[PDB]
Write a protein that holds these residues in place. Structure first.
Motif, PDB file in Angstrom:
ATOM      1  N   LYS A 235       0.773  -1.186   0.149  1.00  0.00           N
ATOM      2  CA  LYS A 235      -0.141  -0.425   0.542  1.00  0.00           C
ATOM      3  C   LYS A 235       0.561   1.301   0.277  1.00  0.00           C
ATOM      4  O   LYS A 235       0.220   2.007  -0.618  1.00  0.00           O
ATOM      5  CB  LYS A 235      -1.140   0.080   1.227  1.00  0.00           C
ATOM      6  CG  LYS A 235      -1.916  -1.025   1.125  1.00  0.00           C
ATOM      7  CD  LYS A 235      -3.007  -0.469   2.693  1.00  0.00           C
ATOM      8  CE  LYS A 235      -4.651  -1.742   2.282  1.00  0.00           C
ATOM      9  NZ  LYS A 235      -5.185  -1.811   3.320  1.00  0.00           N
ATOM     10  N   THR A 261       0.406   0.843   9.363  1.00  0.00           N
ATOM     11  CA  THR A 261      -0.459   0.436   8.924  1.00  0.00           C
ATOM     12  C   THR A 261      -1.163   1.728   9.064  1.00  0.00           C
ATOM     13  O   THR A 261      -2.019   1.969   8.921  1.00  0.00           O
ATOM     14  CB  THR A 261      -0.631  -0.599  10.600  1.00  0.00           C
ATOM     15  OG1 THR A 261      -0.202  -2.037  10.365  1.00  0.00           O
ATOM     16  CG2 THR A 261      -2.439  -0.602  10.466  1.00  0.00           C
ATOM     17  N   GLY A 262      -0.947   2.764  10.480  1.00  0.00           N
ATOM     18  CA  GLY A 262      -1.962   4.050  10.640  1.00  0.00           C
ATOM     19  C   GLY A 262      -1.865   5.152   9.387  1.00  0.00           C
ATOM     20  O   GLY A 262      -2.506   5.668   9.111  1.00  0.00           O
ATOM     21  N   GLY A 265      -4.131   3.813   5.792  1.00  0.00           N
ATOM     22  CA  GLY A 265      -4.919   4.117   5.792  1.00  0.00           C
ATOM     23  C   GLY A 265      -5.428   5.329   5.342  1.00  0.00           C
ATOM     24  O   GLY A 265      -6.253   5.597   5.256  1.00  0.00           O
ATOM     25  N   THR A 267      -5.477   6.547   2.040  1.00  0.00           N
ATOM     26  CA  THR A 267      -5.023   5.651   0.361  1.00  0.00           C
ATOM     27  C   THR A 267      -5.978   6.807   0.090  1.00  0.00           C
ATOM     28  O   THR A 267      -4.584   7.066  -1.852  1.00  0.00           O
ATOM     29  CB  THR A 267      -6.958   4.764   0.353  1.00  0.00           C
ATOM     30  OG1 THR A 267      -6.235   4.229   1.736  1.00  0.00           O
ATOM     31  CG2 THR A 267      -6.618   3.926  -0.378  1.00  0.00           C
ATOM     32  N   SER A 288      -7.997  15.637   8.698  1.00  0.00           N
ATOM     33  CA  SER A 288      -7.333  14.489   8.977  1.00  0.00           C
ATOM     34  C   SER A 288      -7.819  14.490  10.663  1.00  0.00           C
ATOM     35  O   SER A 288      -7.903  15.177  11.270  1.00  0.00           O
ATOM     36  CB  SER A 288      -6.474  13.721   8.897  1.00  0.00           C
ATOM     37  OG  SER A 288      -5.683  14.920   9.185  1.00  0.00           O
TER      38      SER A 288
END
Ligand SMILES: C[C@@H](O[C@H]1OCCN(Cc2nc(=O)[nH][nH]2)[C@H]1c1ccc(F)cc1)c1cc(C(F)(F)F)cc(C(F)(F)F)c1
Length: 398
Positions: A235, A261-262, A265, A267, A288
């Protein structure tokens, strides 16, 4: 052979332009610094020395050098023959070493702030020394300068004692060329690159230390771990690969705060950056939860993605950057103006016949015009790239 009157008047006007703009401009520059007493800033004291050296060379040599080149006759006698050959070497040495002194002063103030070297008395002793070494270096050229009297004219020519191959004359000429051109430009070149990198550049370590008693934080090993992790992540890898070094640091900065991982997010924002839609990504990221919880860090990271520069991790208003840009321009102007001159005088050793053949008088008048124009550009540069200097020129008006 090309000698029309339509050209001589056109050249005489081009040459007077130099004498006027150099005297007018540099006398005003000397006035701005010396009379204000608030303006006496060590760097400006060397600029005064540079302004004096400039104005002097224009007044003393421009008329005398132009007339000799045009008529091939020496009008001003044996003393001014010795003087017009001595003074340019001394004035150019003083100019380029005053520029070096400024470069060394900035280098010291920026890179080594704890060891001070700026002192009014010391600055005066430096300027004092610069001129002593300049007059000494110029001396052999002036010493061996003489006139030759012939039936139709008088000729000013420099004649060194007779030797098997005139080594001392060629060694002297090379030494002068190194001391007034190549060597100080290498020193100034070194100083302003190091200073330039300090004032304008930065890196991820500098960045992470700002955004993130107590133990010292070990970023060195984690930055490499963060790069290895992004390139393993499906990703984040296409985005990261597409980014320039500055924007890559902004993405890693985010990973240090929220983890791999954060960050994955975001995308939509990650596709905007990949597509190089900076403002669009900057607008979406400011919406955000991350931005809400930590607005100051997020604004710095967002600005890095928007501009692609280190602007957020440097001071907004800096008198340091204004001076360094101004002085880099001045030095680049000097290097340009003197390069054809030094090549023109270096060539009689490589190809002695190549010059004398063609119409080198129009060549020499262009080359000498360029060299002598270096004497008028500095006040112009100060008004264009400095606020306090341009306001000072405006004040000298009735
Ligand atoms: C004085 C004159 O000197 C040149 O003309 C005479 C012969 N001379 C070759 C030589 N004969 C020797 O015996 N030694 N050198 C030339 C020369 C000397 C040293 C050099 F580095 C370069 C050329 C000169 C020098 C400069 C400088 F200082 F900028 F260079 C600037 C200007 C001006 F801008 F005013 F036109 C004029």
């Amino acid at each position: 052979f090309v000698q029309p009157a339509w050209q001589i008047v056109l050249w005489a006007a081009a040459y007077t332009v130099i004498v006027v703009t150099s005297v007018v401009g540099n006398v005003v520059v000397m006035w701005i610094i010396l009379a204000h007493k608030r303006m006496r800033t060590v760097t400006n004291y060397f600029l005064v020395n540079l302004a004096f050296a400039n104005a002097s060379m224009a007044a003393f040599n421009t008329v005398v050098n132009f007339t000799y080149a045009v008529h091939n006759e020496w009008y001003y006698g044996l003393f001014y023959c010795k003087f017009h050959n001595f003074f340019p070497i001394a004035a150019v040495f003083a100019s380029i070493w005053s520029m070096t002194a400024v470069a060394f002063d900035r280098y010291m103030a920026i890179i080594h702030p704890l060891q001070p070297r700026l002192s009014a008395t010391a600055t005066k002793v430096v300027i004092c020394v610069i001129w002593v070494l300049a007059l000494l270096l110029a001396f052999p050229q002036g010493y061996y300068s003489t006139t030759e009297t012939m039936p139709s004219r008088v000729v000013c020519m420099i004649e060194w004692p007779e030797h098997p191959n005139k080594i001392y004359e060629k060694v002297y000429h090379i030494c002068v060329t190194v001391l007034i051109y190549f060597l100080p430009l290498l020193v100034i070149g070194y100083a302003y690159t190091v200073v330039g990198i300090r004032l304008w550049a930065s890196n991820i370590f500098e960045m992470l230390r700002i955004d993130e008693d107590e133990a010292e934080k070990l970023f060195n090993q984690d930055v490499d771990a963060a790069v290895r992790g992004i390139l393993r992540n499906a990703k984040l890898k296409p985005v990261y690969d597409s980014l320039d070094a500055v924007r890559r640091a902004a993405l890693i900065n985010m990973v240090f705060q929220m983890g791999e991982t954060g960050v994955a997010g975001f995308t939509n924002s990650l596709r905007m950056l990949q597509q190089k839609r900076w403002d669009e990504a900057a607008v979406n990221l400011a919406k955000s939860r991350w931005y809400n919880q930590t607005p100051n860090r997020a604004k710095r990271v967002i600005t890095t993605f928007r501009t692609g520069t280190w602007d957020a991790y440097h001071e907004q208003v800096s008198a340091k950057r204004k001076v360094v840009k101004m002085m880099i321009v001045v030095v680049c102007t000097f290097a340009i103006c003197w390069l054809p001159f030094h090549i023109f005088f270096l060539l009689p050793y490589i190809n002695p016949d190549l010059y004398l053949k063609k119409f080198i008088q129009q060549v020499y008048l262009a080359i000498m015009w360029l060299a002598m124009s270096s004497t008028m550009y500095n006040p112009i540069i100060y008004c264009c790239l400095n606020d306090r200097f341009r306001l000072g020129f405006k004040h000298a008006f009735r």
